[PDB]
């Protein structure tokens, strides 16, 4: 068994995972290899390479992927949208009145004919 | 001024064990870098 495979398995075990599947650590190692290769190539094309080139390459890469993670207060997680824009959209939506329903239609009405699966056979 | 965990851990070389143990000296997560983001957004 290679090195850092035992370390990744120990890290997973120390976080609640009671069982694994043999091949996960290999996947993670190959992913790390590919990420390192991509970032290195980008930095080499940017500019011997300094730390500024590496930082610029990472910043450029962050523009179209890795928009996730467990970020909290003002952390770019769950898509990366800003809370003010979402609040504006929520204010716009939550301004309309709730639909009017009668007891004879409570549970039997459906959307218009344009938004239902009618005649798909 | 629980048994097999010991075997799994001791399978590692002492150098790797020391490297893992050195994590405890990290200065936790002040996340003070968020100050600039908050200032920009405020």
């Amino acid at each position: 068994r290679p090195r850092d495979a035992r370390t990744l398995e120990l890290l997973l075990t120390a976080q609640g995972v009671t069982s694994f599947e043999p091949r996960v650590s290999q996947l993670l190692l190959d992913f790390a290899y590919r990420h390192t290769a991509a970032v290195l190539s980008d930095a080499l094309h940017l500019s011997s390479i300094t730390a500024n080139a590496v930082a610029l390459a990472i910043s450029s890469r962050l523009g179209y992927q890795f928009r996730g993670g467990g970020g909290g207060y003002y952390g770019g997680g769950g898509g990366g949208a800003s809370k003010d824009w979402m609040l504006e959209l929520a204010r716009e939506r939550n301004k309309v009145a709730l639909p009017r329903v009668l007891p004879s239609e409570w549970g039997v009405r459906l959307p218009g004919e344009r938004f239902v699966l009618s005649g798909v056979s | 001024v629980e048994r097999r965990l010991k075997g799994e851990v001791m399978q590692l070389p002492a150098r790797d064990r020391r490297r893992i143990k050195e994590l405890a000296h990290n200065d936790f997560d002040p996340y003070d870098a968020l100050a600039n983001v908050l200032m920009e957004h405020a």
Binding site: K83, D84, L87, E88, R91 | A35, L38, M39, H41, A42
Partner: peptide, 27 residues
């Protein structure tokens, strides 16, 4: 000139802004 008196009600954005400003105001 004609005179008027009106009242402006609070919103959730106002509370969000208040907390955000308090977060970055030194003591």
């Amino acid at each position: 000139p004609t005179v008027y008196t009106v009242v402006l009600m609070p919103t959730a954005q106002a509370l969000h802004t208040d907390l955000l400003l308090k977060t970055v105001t030194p003591r």
